[PDB]
Amino acid sequence: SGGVFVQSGGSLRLSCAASGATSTFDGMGWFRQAPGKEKEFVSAISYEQGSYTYYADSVKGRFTISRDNSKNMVYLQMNSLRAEDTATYYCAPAYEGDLYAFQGTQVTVSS
């Protein structure tokens, strides 16, 4: 029903708590699901500095994922948003960059 609303060309920052590397998980990331479409990878980052920073092709150059291990936080800076970024955004723990979901932020970008 309700969500965030951004003008095309605008920007938005998401955040997600990150417990830290358990036995099963070495990272955190985000996927999104647009109306009537499949869930699509967005971005993933390793808890270990250097280990991995994946982005979907559709967001490279516009989105930036970052971590603050001191705060147990992960962040997604979303710049130059376009109408096709309209979706619900979910964060999930990562193992080797794949996201595992077992809670979302709806974002509408208007042209």
């Binding site: 869930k39 990878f41 994946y54 996201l99 979901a101 077992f102």
Partner: peptide
């Protein structure tokens, strides 16, 4: 029991 996986890029 079950899991949803969203794969990193090919």
């Amino acid at each position: 029991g079950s899991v949803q996986i969203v794969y990193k890029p090919k």
